Design a protein around this nucleic acid. Structure first.
Lengths: 260, 203, 133
RNA sequence: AAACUUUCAACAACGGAUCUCUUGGUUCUGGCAUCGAUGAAGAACGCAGCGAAAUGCGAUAAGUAAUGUGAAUUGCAGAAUUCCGUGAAUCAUCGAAUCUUUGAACGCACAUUGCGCCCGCCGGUAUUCCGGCGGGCAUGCCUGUUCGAGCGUCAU
RNA sequence: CCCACCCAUACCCCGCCCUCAGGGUAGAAACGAUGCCCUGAGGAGUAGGCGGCCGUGGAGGUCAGUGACGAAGCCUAGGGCGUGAGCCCGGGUCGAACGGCCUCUAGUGCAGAUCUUGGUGGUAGUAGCAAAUACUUCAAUGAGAACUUGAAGGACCGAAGUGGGGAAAGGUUCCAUGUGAACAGCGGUUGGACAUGGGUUAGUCGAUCCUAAGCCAUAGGGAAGUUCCGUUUCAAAGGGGCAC
RNA sequence: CGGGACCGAGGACCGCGCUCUGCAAGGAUGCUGGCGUAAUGGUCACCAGCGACCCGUCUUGAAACACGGACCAAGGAGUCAAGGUUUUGCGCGAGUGUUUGGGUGUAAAACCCGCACGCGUAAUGAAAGUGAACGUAGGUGAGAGCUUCGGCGCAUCAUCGAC
RNA sequence: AGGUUGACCUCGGAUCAGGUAGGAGGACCCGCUGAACUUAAGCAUAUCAAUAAGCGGAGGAAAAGAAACCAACAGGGAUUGCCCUAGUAACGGCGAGUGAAGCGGCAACAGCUCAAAUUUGAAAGCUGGCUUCGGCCCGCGUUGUAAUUUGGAGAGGAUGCUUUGGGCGAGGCUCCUUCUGAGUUCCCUGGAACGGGACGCCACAGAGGGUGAGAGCCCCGUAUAGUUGGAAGCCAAGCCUGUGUAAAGCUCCUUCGACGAGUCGAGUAGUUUGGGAAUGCUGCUCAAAAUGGGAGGUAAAUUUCUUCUAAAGCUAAAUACCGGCCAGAGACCGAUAGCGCACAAGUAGAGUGAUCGAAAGAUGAAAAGCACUUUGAAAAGAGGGUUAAAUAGCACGUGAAAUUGUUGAAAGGGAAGCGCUUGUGACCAGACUUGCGCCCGGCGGAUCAUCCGGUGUUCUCACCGGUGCACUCCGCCGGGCUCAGGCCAG
């Protein structure tokens, strides 16, 4: 509050022989009288540089960079090493990216949580869902008082096409902890890279896989970016015959003998 | 150049209520559309040309149709605001082109208009019959009757047989000459009156 | 997850409501489950507890003790069960407060209003079951 | 050598830091428009079986009626509830009421529980005396009613 | 003039730490390549500049993390690691949460400010408890009597009183009964203290009535206005009687 | 040719060599004893030899003077916003900026949309106004890199020209 | 009767009949009035600031508002607000500084009422009183109440077609109400499972809270469709009827076409503005006009042009909101923090008064808050108890430091404290305990080599099933041997 530490009447007692020149509460008959006021070093005083609401809370990000990051997160989601490196349990997943038939999610097929849970265990997201179920813990600190009581891991993200798969699968998958749902046309980087870490486990529908190309062809002002590196296999590039045939002979080994 | 020499912190405005105000505006628009159904949520606006030499290349929606436009379209001025047509008595038609364009706009709207009777069991001749009352309708006149061509087309193709000859002497010379006569219009008239007076004196 | 805007998930507001609820609200809060025989008889899972009910304690150190409810002491949110007491130092007996969620009701103190409660709960459960089935 | 002073350690003191807690603040967001002469906001004085305060209430005084719920309140005392019910409760709701002396505060005053006036009703032997009860008596202004004043303008 | 001897962080040799510099390291049997191997030189520091790390509150992700078979905190002549800020463990106490890693964030690191608040020492069982002449004996009460009571003595105020009553101010301090602690700078059975009760009776005493110095309404005039002047005014400001 | 002190860095081989079955030649091995635990090592307290002003601030050139400090716990001081500037990272690029607004939403998030607008793409002049190719976008001297080995010559600099 | 009898006008009275105003609140809003600190080296222009304080007046919004506008264009078209215009035009001692608007995009859109006319073949208008609810009266009013007209026009003509009033109403929406899924299953620890393990179930509900420790299934609630009962409004598909006495619209036109005065404007003064050459407001003086008047940001005259139409008035929305009420949230604070106040806090307490203004949360799951005995006058103490714990005893969770007491150890001839290095005493962390490899002997088993079949792979390497018949493999047990092993040393 802007008036905190300033709703007192206090004046300094001046330069003298006894006490410090801090302003002191006037009057008498109570403990507050004669006590220091208005200082950041004083009890019941105003804090140094009081916080304001016109602090910058929101960050403007370029839409092109947002779309770049979303494309990069989706590209990292199709790399099975990165899924394991992000802590997902995908050892029983038949294929990455995991694509399920839209006949198992369209309409009211998985409108019930039991049906959605059985479909997840059938397609192989069951160990990761169980990981989220078993990882529930109580928060360390004041977040428990401030409405954030429990913490758990992130489970699979099901991406669907609302036009072809409907929206009852959202209600079906809602109550399963850690399981998130997203339309194919409104993909969220906060879900695709939880905590800034790449490799989210995603369950796709066939309709969403069909519609993804139209989704990135309908984004005006944005194209899928050109990489600055054509071949990412540095071992293939270095040990290719084109480079090796023109190299100088080695001038030493990995280890050098001590001369003297 | 920072203007912080007054008590600026007393009247700092923040905008944390921007999403909430968008939600409130959308709820108000939904309520207005539900109250106005099946009429459109807005009124038909004319097409007018922006003033000044900077913006006279572009057209936009105006306030309302003129009385001359309504009279030439055959819509009475008391009926017009009751059937979704905005009326502006201040604007005049100084040229035929804007008048004709707005009259054609009004005729198109009147052709696409469905008018239900005041009493369902007593239809009138000016009202739409019940077998024609059902059709696919629109609820946004700003979208269905927008400014389709705000600017002139920037590219056109002609054959070289019909390339214009151009201003004789050159466009730059024509501009310089026009500026010259604009600056000298008074001097030529003054010398013409002086010469006429001298000729009248010594004829 | 709650969806309605009138529902609050504030722990502070929930605890304030719970510990400052009036007596009629505390009656609903101080509910107890029915025994299996009573549930299959009445198609009712839970009911507020009142004086004269027969209860069996299923939680705590006085587990498997049965007796009549002699007091529904709503001010500390407890009930008193007959013969479930302890001895003070001086040798007199003081009742031990039991929460209604730690007991199960084995015999209902039946009257017209209790029958009305049971009938309307059973009818509501049946019509919910028919609507959702 | 002890005592004394100092240091180190254990236990006990003094004191209330640290840790954990939070029916509380602070900030944001959404919704709503509702004080008063038909007497407000504020003040004072009272009211519970046993309270000083906080809370609630006004001599109908931790309250009445009405609606709803349906078996309590609780620190003690004393009573319950025909439990198959016009019905417990420091219950909720709340449309009917009560609402002391004041206060814009309104008979005149007020540092006084001071002094009046008008009209009814009742009681005490009472045409006269005494007492009690009830309803009233501020200012400015508006519309209207009624009673008036003035050679101000006229008719007769 | 001569010979030997003593020792600086100086000079020589050796080891180790850091910094800088120069090399090596893929048809990878291949590496926290931000790594590892070889070689050389250098090392003080105020104002000032730059880099890397340690710690605190909170946020996202992760460790299928720890925990009532004991989390956090605290104490520790008990240990281990780090140049260091620090980190980790053992033992005791205790009772409900907390931590590591990578990012994000800040009300994030104290010996000072005659700093703020709170608490506590030496001084120190010290200064002092010395104005108003003064106390003593027996008995009772009581656990306990210089400062409670009764009696017995001795004194003081000395009628402009240490007497008897009021005005202001206080508000129950008045009276009876009882009383642990606190207070009565010693004590206390006593108390204006604490607890529970009781007590203030008017035609004649005051107030109430009158007006004084003075203050405030009204008429009316100022003032943007809160309001100012005005108190007999430039006001239609009211009483009585008689009537066939 | 003796006598003594301190040190043993490295860790398959590679090398320089020599007195050449081998070696003192690019850094210590071999043999032996006691003990195997508080014996070595460590921490704490104390004595002993030597060493050693009380911190912070201020002042000037420096000291001195002066100021603050009885003790302990907790609190306690370069923050936030707007506007510039230089540098770093990122996206797009003669363009760039979705978030005033609209659509949409699992609803203050995320996703989508475009008109205008800002900056940049042209300057100069007080203004009216005018407005950037003689030339493979010029000549000369350098200049990394490339080269068919004759030269072509990036950035940039100096200089002479052109608009 | 005329010295009488009256009608008006103006001004009064009444506790006359009926009404209204005051004060509170004031965050936001409409006005008035109005600083100084500060920033300019100082400082009378300036800046802070047309702000704080003071005064008057409203509402849920207020205010503004349907051009005496902007413009100069191919013209826009009430008001308000956001973005941009733009730190720009412009203003400014000795310069510190100040600073709009038109267009453009968007949000939201909504238009109108009088005065100036003769109803004049009919004051057709209205307050109040009494009503039998049909009306009848007392009056207001012609010094003008109705109808008609408002500049976009209109009035009068011509002309021929169009338009209208009531009553039901299915259904829908808003607000309070009844009702909603699944374990208290078994085992261990524990005082108590809500912890761990196992077996299940519900989920459009795994938000939150409570319950003796981390509970989707113990309880309240939570999600979604609905489902009971009640009230008051609004919207509304359609359906019955009267029809033209009257009103209303469109089209054309000779003619007519009233339009706001101490006001506009000018001078002067103060104040204000970016408008110190072009701003607004107010006071004093002067004081208009009829194609007139205002404006067109440099003074004036002449001739043109373009735009509106002042001096009367009303009106939702988009906009503001440190006040009030209801509600939901947070990378906020966690009892010296966060509001002064988490507590009988604007309280206790101080001041004559205006005013000033604290400190202060936590036993335990449950009082189970210590029976009884004993010692003391008592406070209390000791036994004995409660509790899972009193190492939780209403001084109460945890219980740091300063500082104090006891016990143990030590030092001390006018300071201690600190650094380097031994020693003494006390107390400790490591390290070690044997491993590996052979040669024999004794056991216990054929997951020895080869081959066959199947399978997988890195496509030549493996696993599995049969085959070994014990000079081969794998463990164990006794010896013997070599090597490597801890500390201090020669």
């Amino acid at each position: 509050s802007e008036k905190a530490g300033h709703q007192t009447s206090a004046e300094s007692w001046g330069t003298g022989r006894a006490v410090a020149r801090i302003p002191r509460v006037s009057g008498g008959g109570t403990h507050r009288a004669g006590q220091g006021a208005f200082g950041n070093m004083c009890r019941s005083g105003r804090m140094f540089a009081p916080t304001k609401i016109w602090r910058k809370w929101h960050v403007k990000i370029n839409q092109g960079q947002k779309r770049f990051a979303t494309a990069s997160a989706l590209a990292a989601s199709a790399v099975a090493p990165l899924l394991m490196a992000r802590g997902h349990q995908v050892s029983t997943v038949p294929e990455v990216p995991l694509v399920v038939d839209s006949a198992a999610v369209a309409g009211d097929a998985v409108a019930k949580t039991a049906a959605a849970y059985k479909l997840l265990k059938a397609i192989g997201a069951g160990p990761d869902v169980e990981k989220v179920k078993k990882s529930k813990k109580l928060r360390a600190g004041k977040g428990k008082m401030r409405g954030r009581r429990h913490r758990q891991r992130r489970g699979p993200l099901i991406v669907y096409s609302p036009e072809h798969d409907g929206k009852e699968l959202v209600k079906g998958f809602r109550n399963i902890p850690g399981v998130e749902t997203c339309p194919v046309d409104a993909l969220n980087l906060l879900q695709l890279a939880p905590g800034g870490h790449l490799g989210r486990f995603i369950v796709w529908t066939s309709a969403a896989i069909k519609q993804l190309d139209a989704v990135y062809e309908s984004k005006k002002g944005f194209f899928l970016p050109a990489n600055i590196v054509s071949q990412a296999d540095l071992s293939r590039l270095i040990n290719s015959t084109e480079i090796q045939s023109v190299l100088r002979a080695p001038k030493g080994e990995a280890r050098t003998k001590r001369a003297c | 150049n920072n203007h912080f020499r007054k008590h600026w912190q007393r009247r700092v405005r923040c905008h944390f209520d921007q999403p909430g105000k968008k939600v409130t505006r959308r709820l108000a628009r939904r309520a207005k559309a539900a109250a106005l159904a099946p009429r459109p949520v807005d009124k038909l606006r004319p097409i007018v040309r922006c003033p000044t030499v900077k913006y006279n290349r572009r057209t936009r929606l105006g306030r309302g149709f003129t009385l001359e436009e309504l009279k030439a379209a055959g819509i009475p001025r008391l009926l017009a605001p009751t059937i979704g047509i905005a009326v502006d008595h201040r604007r005049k038609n100084l040229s035929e082109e804007s008048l004709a364009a707005n009259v054609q706009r009004l005729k198109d709207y009147k052709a696409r208009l469905i008018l239900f009777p005041r009493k369902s069991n007593k239809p009138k001749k000016a009202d739409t019959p019940k077998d024609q009352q059902t059709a696919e309708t629109t609820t946004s006149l700003r979208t269905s009757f927008g400014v389709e061509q705000p600017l002139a087309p920037g590219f056109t193709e002609i054959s070289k047989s019909e390339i214009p000859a151009g201003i004789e002497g050159g466009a730059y010379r024509a501009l310089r000459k026009a500026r010259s006569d604009a600056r000298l219009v008074g001097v030529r008239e003054k010398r013409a009156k002086e010469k006429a007076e001298a000729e009248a004196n010594k004829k | 997850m709650k969806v309605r805007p009138t529902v609050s998930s504030s722990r502070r507001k929930a605890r304030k409501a719970h510990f400052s609820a009036p007596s009629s609200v505390r009656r609903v809060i101080m509910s107890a489950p029915l025994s299996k025989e009573l549930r299959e008889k009445y198609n009712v899972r839970s009911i507020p507890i009142r004086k004269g009910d027969e209860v069996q304690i299923v939680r705590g150190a006085h587990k498997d003790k049965e007796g009549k409810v002699t007091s529904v002491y709503r001010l500390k949110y407890v009930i008193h069960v007959e013969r479930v007491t302890r001895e003070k130092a001086t040798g007199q007996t003081v009742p031990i407060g039991i929460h209604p969620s730690n007991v199960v009701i084995t015999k209902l103190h039946l009257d017209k209003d209790r029958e009305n409660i049971l009938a309307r709960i059973k009818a509501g459960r049946e019509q919910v079951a028919k609507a959702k089935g």
